[PDB]
Specification:
The PDB classes it as membrane protein. Keywords: K+-ATPase, human. It forms a trimeric assembly. The entry is titled "Cryo-EM structure of human sodium pump E1003K complexed with NDRG3 in (2Na+)E1-AMPPCP state". The complex is a heterotrimer of chains A (298), B (255) and C (937). Chain A has 298 residues and is an alpha/beta fold. Chain A has a single domain, classed as Alpha/Beta hydrolase fold, catalytic domain (Rossmann fold). Chain A has a five-stranded parallel β-sheet with strand order 4-6-7-8-9, sandwiched between helices. Chain A has a four-stranded mixed β-sheet with strand order 1-2-5-3, with no helix packed on it. In chain A, a hairpin with an 8-residue loop joins strand 1 and strand 2. The longest helix of chain A has 13 residues. Chain B is an alpha+beta fold and 255 residues long. Chain B folds into two domains: 40 residues; 208 residues, Na, k-atpase alpha subunit (Immunoglobulin-like, Sandwich). Chain B has two helices and nine strands, in the order H-E-E-H-E-E-E-E-E-E-E. In chain B, strands 2, 4, 5, 8 and 9 form a five-stranded mixed β-sheet that branches. Chain B has a four-stranded antiparallel β-sheet with strand order 1-3-7-6, with no helix packed on it. Chain C is of the alpha+beta class. Chain C has five domains: 130 residues, Calcium-transporting ATPase, cytoplasmic transduction domain A (Distorted Sandwich), CATH 2.70.150; 74 residues; 204 residues, HAD superfamily/HAD-like (Rossmann fold); 182 residues, Calcium-transporting ATPase, cytoplasmic domain N; 205 residues, Calcium-transporting ATPase, transmembrane domain (Up-down Bundle). Chain C contains 31 helices and 29 strands. In chain C, a hairpin with a 4-residue loop joins strand 11 and strand 12. The chains are: A alpha/beta (298), B alpha+beta (255), C alpha+beta (937). Chains in contact: A-C, B-C. The interface between A and C is large, with 43 and 56 residues. The complex binds phosphomethylphosphonic acid adenylate ester and sodium ion (NA) (2 copies). The site of one sodium ion has 5 residues of chain C, from loops.
């Protein structure tokens, strides 16, 4: 349960490890979304009562953004050299700096893209991924025109809330919009948030293609890990995840469109997301002597 | 179809009420938008005057069929409509109706500028027996019908040069047409026109055409062609519009 | 023509084709033979020359009316230019405009139909038909196209035959030759010559048929065009409803056209003008392209659900998948991940644990017990699963195994605990093998024991724990055979209740040393008519392996409960394991109790339990065989959560028929040859795309590309968004008919100059033609779609009186008033104020009145009036079209001489025609009609 700073290779990234009992068991790497931080993205979920069954059996890490979580040093000129392809490839040094064999990463939004790119670059350090609201596609021009033409005068927190939460969800505040808006405004500073958003706006198209039965063995670049795609049924990223659900090997990937949720499934519906993660991990040979949830409480 | 032969199963009253309210709301929106659009328009001069750039020409009275005047020198009921229309039209031109109007110098545009906008006088005596002062019948009884040729009013149009209406008979020019005043000279003191609201009591210039049917050629069909001659401003040649600076009519006086 | 290799013995096959009949030809030889013959499954049909498909769109339907109108205009201009010198170039331009209208309409129809055709043809390439061949010693599965004449092909149960095979090795293959011989009764296939006619012998299996029992091996002799098959050569309710609606609206359009033609003739129209007005007001009113729009909607939804791993085989499955009210699913593979790991054992009278991480033996136990030795030997021997010869450095559990998931789990467990399963099988040679069958529920094998005290024959058995204990007379405890008694049997049942109560699949293992005096070294062992003592075996122990539910399955069952879909679990596993899994995934939700549960909550016998107090039941398969037809109805009508345990694949048909007698729309799951009648009787037949037989994929109406139950529910949700998007398209098709017919009515009534002519009526119809298609292309989703009870397709109509009252009278009227506003403003800014226009129709339109006075005193000739009228007509058309497109965009954003569009204080344009739209979308919102077409505001 200590906070560690990795060696300055193409930048420095702050990580937080909750323990090192694994030896051989994989760890649970994490990567938050744009404008957020681990204390606001995964802390509200890993401390859940139903998640204690998993947290006590795996080492949980928390890889923050190339910016900062506590304080706001920022950069004078900014110079956001580490892009998503650059951010993904700085993870193997992090793993070698903590003696981590392999990670079961779980990323939200841009963190999901970073983990996917890291898995594509190094399909041996990751055993499985939980891609929440993943978007392996560039903005193109069709939505790029609407992202800036009608939003020339738009605050960055409004842009982040539009990216995360659904249209009606932000239209009608349920005090969750207020809580996460104050989380965005305070804590993490605006400069690094804007820099991260600008870096993420590029989002070069991830190379993934669904294997065809016996013909495309010559060219195929689909993930080799057990994938669990999570997205709320009332979020603006549903189409992105369905696009990622396609062009992905339907033998190991899983698509979960949760019914009564939308926006951030990790905080709105934690009790179902933790059950899904437990079932996803249990089929990988892990936590075998666990309890099947909903079995009449026992 | 049915016991009552209708579909009014306690319905058709609620439907009627709902559509009454919906169309009342829609009509209210439409009427308010129309009113608020009309408030942006002038009451004295059109917003756009580029669709009526040049004056047309027209004849009076309007016949029943096309522009074909037909009557008989004998029957007074054949040309009663012509007489009544000519007398009704020329009433505001008479001596007792132009008394309030003013007298303007000839051969110059009466460019008024100021909230008075007096109108000059067109003396009905300029028509020279094509008015009703000599004979109540405008030459129809005598066999020499009189027809008025008018230039369409355009707000702010100032003709250049010396406007004139040139009517030439096409029926071998045997019934030589008589044009009044003079040779159809349109005077410049009636121009420009300042609108129905500003130019109160405005009387436009008239040209009267009398075709004299001799007994030898009575019963023919004289085709007369008039044009706005003498003013380069006012167009008279156009393929599509046959009445732009022109008018053609046929007069047939049955024996 | 026979020309076959039936009577030609095996030696010539090695010569006639140059392939050795134990390893098949090499990859290079296979490719070389493929290069000169072509793909195996060619069977190419002809196609339409693709210009007939465009000529039919041009000259077809109501485009013939516009062609007739153009011909009439050209004839009128011809007679005009003949009789009169220097004619008016008006009929010529009118004919050219009509011709352009038909051309553009045909182009839209063509590039709307040859996009749905592309989407629908994309699906046929998603699941290529494959084949198992033996090239370069090992078996490599390839596309059936790559199969060539002369290679070795293996076929098994539920396998479509890649091509004509000369069978050289077979144990029990029975092909379904109904495709050629007509009779569907399976015919056995053997490697020997049996009949002169190729179609009647037993050593040849024909192309496009499938072997339905057992396995066989053959040499491909004929490919697609040379095969025996290559040598030989219904309306959905939505379609019927839309066809009826189109016919009714077409009749309405023709009536309106006739009445307007007569009225225009009354208003002094020329005959050539009135005829064109008729053919324009008919064409603009019939719903052209409505069938194309619904085809686009269906194909788009089929494409979008295929992205979610639901592959429909036809567009009728798309509309049926939205009306689902029951889903009969299978536990293993569909509701569970089918990735099992051994976690408990029970051989002695104690439950022994197991664990990964080879070191320390895993928890605390090792090979000390001879009972464990025997149990591990049975598990290793009876398995058919083999590690794929690769990834040796990888961990034993983290490997790749070919076989059943249970057999794979057993193999991995034995390799981790004992090790050297391959050498263990080498020591005990397999004399005869009885494959696992869902009807038998056990796997039997006989092996040779090199042991010292061996009776020279060892019998190995595994299968259902209770079907194995019914033929076991002794229980092996600490290596000592003890008689099977009620002291051990109740302990066995308690162990089953504990291991099975955790949702763990349990298998029973038993053996019997076949006596030597009864079974000598060379005793006859034949699979058919078995002679070994299957009864009276020696029970050894149980092994339980966890099979976790799929991650997205509990949420999917929650969605099904939110909707009115009744999920039924049909499984062959034990009632204990089935009930535990059903409770775990939420099929039996908390609160619901079985009869055996309410007999235990309050201690009374089962016979005293009131059946109506239980809404959840677990029905054994044997208890279903003796049920009458009316007795199954009591199960399905009164119980809201039903589990069918120990149910054979041939009782799925009974279950589906019983569900369909309840007036339900049943979606059933199958992955075998025996499931085919259920997959065809069910309203939606769902086949597993990963581990499903070719026979099931032929019988199914839909293929699960990931074998995931949650994908079925996602496809149901996607197909539910097909009627709300269809009535939207119908309404958008109907909204433009009032802006086109109201100008003439107001013309007649108010006697104003004509607001819209019959060239801009067709221009409005042309501009606002693709709006419904673009609407359903940009349609995102809905919100409460899965909180809505299933559609009743028989008694729920796509078109009701509220949709028609909406389109024809609330949206169309708003658009018409916007166009009228544009017309009024254009006229008023040229001098003719709105109050002046009333009654001006007769002075206007009179070619001989060339001094018509406006509101400002000016006087207009006929042509000067008509230029402004033409401007008003074009502005009306532009306003209608632009506002329709802008309203489309705004509606998809807010909720989930062409004067218009001008900036110079032109709020008369699309600005107001859309401002009335947005001002009435709020009043219809506030009034809040609940029964709710407040949408389409
Ligand atoms: N390879 C195998 N060898 C021997 N017995 C097997 C076996 N696979 C399964 N069994 C046993 O036979 C029983 C019958 O299984 P069956 O094929 O009828 O349904 P299933 O349990 O295999 C999958 P589902 O529940 O989806 O139908 C199983 O419950 C299991 O106990
Ligand atoms: Na049409
Ligand atoms: Na129409």
């Amino acid at each position: 349960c200590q906070e560690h700073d990795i060696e300055t290779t193409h930048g420095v990234v702050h990580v937080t490890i909750r323990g090192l009992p694994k030896g051989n068991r994989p760890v649970i790497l994490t990567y938050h979304d744009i404008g957020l931080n681990h204390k606001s993205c995964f802390n509200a979920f890993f401390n859940f009562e139903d998640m204690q069954e998993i947290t006590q059996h795996f080492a949980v890490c928390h890889v923050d953004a190339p910016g900062q979580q506590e304080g706001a040093p920022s950069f004078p000129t900014g110079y956001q050299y580490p892009t998503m392809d650059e951010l993904a490839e700085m993870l193997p040094p992090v793993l070698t700096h903590l003696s981590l064999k392999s990670i079961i990463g779980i990323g939200v939004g841009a963190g999901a893209y970073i983990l996917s790119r890291f898995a594509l670059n190094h399909p041996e350090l990751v055993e499985g991924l939980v891609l929440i609201n993943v978007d392996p596609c560039a903005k193109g021009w069709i939505d790029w025109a609407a992202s800036k033409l009608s939003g020339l005068t738009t605050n960055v927190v409004d842009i982040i809330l539009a990216h995360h939460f659904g249209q009606e969800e932000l239209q009608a505040n349920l005090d969750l919009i207020q809580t996460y808006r104050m989380h965005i405004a305070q804590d993490i500073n605006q400069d690094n948030l804007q820099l991260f958003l600008n870096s993420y706006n590029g989002r070069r198209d991830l190379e993934i293609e669904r294997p065809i039965l016996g013909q495309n063995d010559n060219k195929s670049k689909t993930l080799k890990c057990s994938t669990l795609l999570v997205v709320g049924d009332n979020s603006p990223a549903v189409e992105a995840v369905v696009e990622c659900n396609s062009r992905l090997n339907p033998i190991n990937t899983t698509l979960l469109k949760m019914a009564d949720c939308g926006g951030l499934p990790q905080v709105v519906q934690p009790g179902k997301l933790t059950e899904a993660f437990k079932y996803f991990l249990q089929g990988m040979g892990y936590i075998p002597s666990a309890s099947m949830t909903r079995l009449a409480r026992s | 179809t049915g016991e009552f032969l209708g579909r009014t199963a306690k319905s058709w009253g609620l439907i009627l009420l709902f559509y009454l309210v919906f169309y009342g709301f829609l009509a209210a929106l439409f009427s308010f938008t129309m009113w608020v659009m009309l408030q942006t328009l002038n009451d004295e001069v059109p917003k756009y005057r580029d669709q009526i750039p040049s004056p047309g020409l027209m004849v009076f009275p309007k016949p029943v069929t096309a522009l074909e005047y037909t009557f008989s020198r004998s029957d007074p009921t054949s040309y009663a409509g012509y007489i009544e229309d000519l007398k009704k039209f020329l009433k505001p031109y008479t001596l007792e109706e132009q008394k309030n109007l003013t007298v303007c110098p000839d051969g110059a545009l009466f460019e008024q500028k100021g909230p008075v906008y007096v109108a000059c006088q067109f003396p009905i005596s300029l028509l020279q027996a094509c008015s009703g002062m000599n004979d109540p019948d405008f030459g129809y009884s005598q066999g020499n019908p009189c027809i008025l040729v008018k230039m369409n009013r355009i707000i702010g149009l100032k003709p250049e040069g010396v406007p004139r209406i040139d009517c030439v008979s096409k029926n071998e020019d045997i019934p030589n047409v008589a044009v009044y005043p003079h040779n159809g000279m349109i005077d410049l003191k009636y121009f420009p026109y300042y609108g129905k609201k500003l130019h109160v009591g405005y009387l436009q210039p008239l040209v009267a055409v009398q075709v004299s049917f001799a007994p030898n050629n009575t019963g023919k069909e004289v085709t007369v062609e008039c044009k706005i001659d003498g003013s380069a401003n006012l167009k008279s040649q156009d393929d599509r519009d046959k009445f732009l600076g022109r008018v053609m009519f046929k007069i047939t006086a049955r024996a | 023509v026979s020309m076959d290799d039936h009577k030609l013995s095996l030696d010539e096959l090695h010569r006639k084709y140059g392939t050795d009949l134990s390893r098949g030809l090499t990859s290079a030889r296979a490719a070389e033979i493929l290069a000169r013959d072509g793909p195996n499954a060619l069977t190419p049909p002809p196609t339409t020359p693709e210009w007939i498909k465009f000529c039919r769109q041009l000259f077809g339907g109501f485009s013939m009316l516009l062609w007739i109108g153009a011909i009439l205009c050209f004839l009128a201009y011809s007679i005009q230019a003949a009789t009169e010198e220097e004619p008016q170039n008006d009929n010529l331009y009118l004919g050219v405009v009509l011709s352009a209208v038909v051309i553009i309409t045909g182009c839209f129809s063509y590039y709307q139909e040859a996009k749905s055709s592309k989407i629908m043809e994309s699906f046929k390439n998603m699941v290529p038909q494959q084949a198992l061949v033996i090239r370069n010693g090992e078996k490599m599965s390839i596309n059936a196209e790559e199969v060539v004449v002369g290679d070795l092909v293996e076929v098994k149960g539920g396998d479509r035959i890649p091509a004509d095979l000369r069978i050289i090795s077979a144990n029990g293959c029975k092909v379904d030759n109904s495709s050629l011989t007509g009779e569907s009764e399976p015919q056995t296939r053997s490697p020997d010559f049996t009949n002169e006619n190729p179609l009647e012998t037993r050593n040849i299996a024909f192309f496009s048929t499938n072997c339905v029992e057992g396995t066989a091996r053959g040499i491909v002799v004929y490919t697609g065009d040379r095969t025996v098959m290559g040598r030989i050569a219904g309306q959905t309710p939505i379609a019927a409803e839309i066809e009826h609606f189109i016919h009714i609206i077409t009749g309405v359009a023709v009536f309106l056209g006739v009445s307007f033609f007569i009225l225009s003739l009354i208003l002094e129209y020329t005959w050539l003008e009135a005829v064109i007005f008729l053919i324009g007001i008919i064409v603009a009113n019939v719903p052209e392209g409505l069938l194309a729009t619904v085809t686009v909607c269906l194909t788009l939804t089929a494409k979008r659900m295929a992205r979610k791993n639901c592959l429909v085989k036809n567009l009728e499955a798309v509309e049926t998948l939205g009306s689902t009210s029951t889903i009969c699913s299978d536990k293993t593979g569909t509701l569970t991940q089918n990735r099992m790991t051994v976690a408990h054992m029970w051989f002695d009278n104690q439950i022994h644990e197991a664990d990964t991480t080879e070191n320390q033996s895993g928890v605390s136990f090792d090979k000390t017990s001879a009972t464990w030795l025997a149990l591990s030997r049975i598990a290793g021997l009876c398995n058919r699963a083999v590690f794929q010869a690769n990834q040796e450095n990888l961990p034993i559990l983290k490997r790749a195994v070919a076989g059943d998931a249970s057999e794979s789990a057993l193999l991995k467990c034995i390799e981790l605990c004992c090790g050297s399963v391959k050498e263990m099988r080498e020591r005990y040679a397999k004399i005869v093998e009885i494959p696992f069958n869902s009807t038998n529920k056990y796997q039997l094998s006989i092996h040779k024991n090199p042991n010292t005290s061996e009776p020279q024959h060892l019998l190995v058995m595994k299968g259902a724990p209770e079907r194995i204990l019914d033929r076991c007379s002794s229980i092996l405890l600490h290596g000592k055979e003890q008689p099977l008694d009620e002291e051990l049997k109740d302990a066995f049942q308690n162990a089953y209740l504990e291991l099975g109560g955790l949702g763990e699949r349990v298998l029973g293992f038993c053996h019997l040393f076949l006596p030597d005096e009864q079974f000598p070294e060379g005793f006859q062992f034949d699979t058919d008519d078995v002679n070994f003592p299957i009864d009276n075996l020696c029970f050894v122990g149980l092994i339980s392996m966890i099979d976790p539910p799929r991650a997205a399955v509990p949420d999917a069952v929650g969605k099904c409960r939110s909707a009115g879909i009744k999920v039924i679990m049909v499984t062959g596993d034990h009632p204990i394991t089935a009930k535990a899994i059903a409770k775990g995934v939420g099929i039996i939700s908390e609160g619901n109790e079985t009869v055996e549960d309410i007999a235990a909550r309050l201690n009374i016998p089962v016979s005293q339990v009131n059946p109506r107090d239980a809404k959840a039941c677990v029905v054994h398969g044997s208890d279903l065989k003796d049920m009458t037809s009316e007795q199954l109805d009591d199960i399905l009508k009164y119980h809201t959560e039903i589990v069918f345990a120990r149910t054979s694949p041939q009782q799925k048909l009974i279950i589906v028929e019983g569900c369909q007698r309840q007036g339900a729309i049943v979606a059933v799951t199958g992955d075998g040859v025996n499931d085919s009648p259920a997959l065809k009787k069910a309203d939606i037949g769902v086949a597993m795309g990963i581990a499903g037989s070719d026979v099931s994929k032929q019988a199914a109406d839909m293929i699960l590309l990931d074998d995931n139950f949650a994908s079925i529910v996602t496809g149901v949700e996607e197909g539910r968004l097909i009627f709300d998007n269809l009535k939207k398209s119908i309404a958008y098709t109907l909204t433009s008919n009032i802006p086109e017919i109201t100008p003439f009515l107001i013309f007649i009534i108010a006697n104003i100059p004509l607001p819209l002519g019959t060239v801009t009526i067709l221009c409005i119809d042309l501009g606002t033609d693709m709006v419904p298609a673009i609407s359903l292309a940009y349609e995102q989703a809905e919100s409460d779609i899965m909180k809505r009870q299933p559609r009743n397709p028989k008694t729920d109509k796509l078109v009701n009186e509220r949709l028609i009252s909406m389109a024809y009278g609330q949206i169309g009227m708003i658009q018409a008033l916007g166009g009228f506003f544009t017309y009024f403003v254009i006229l008023a800014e040229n001098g003719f104020l709105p109050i002046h226009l009333l009654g001006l129709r007769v002075d206007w339109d009179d070619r001989w009145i060339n001094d018509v006075e406006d509101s400002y005193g000016q006087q207009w000739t006929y042509e000067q009036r008509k230029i402004v009228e033409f401007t008003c007509h074009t502005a009306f058309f532009v306003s209608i079209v632009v506002v329709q497109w802008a309203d489309l965009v705004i509606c998809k954003t807010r909720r989930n001489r062409m004067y218009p569009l001008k900036p110079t204080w032109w709020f008369c344009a699309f600005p107001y025609s859309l401002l009335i739209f947005v001002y009435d979308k709020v009043r219809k919102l506030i009034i809040r009609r609940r029964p709710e077409k407040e949408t389409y505001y």
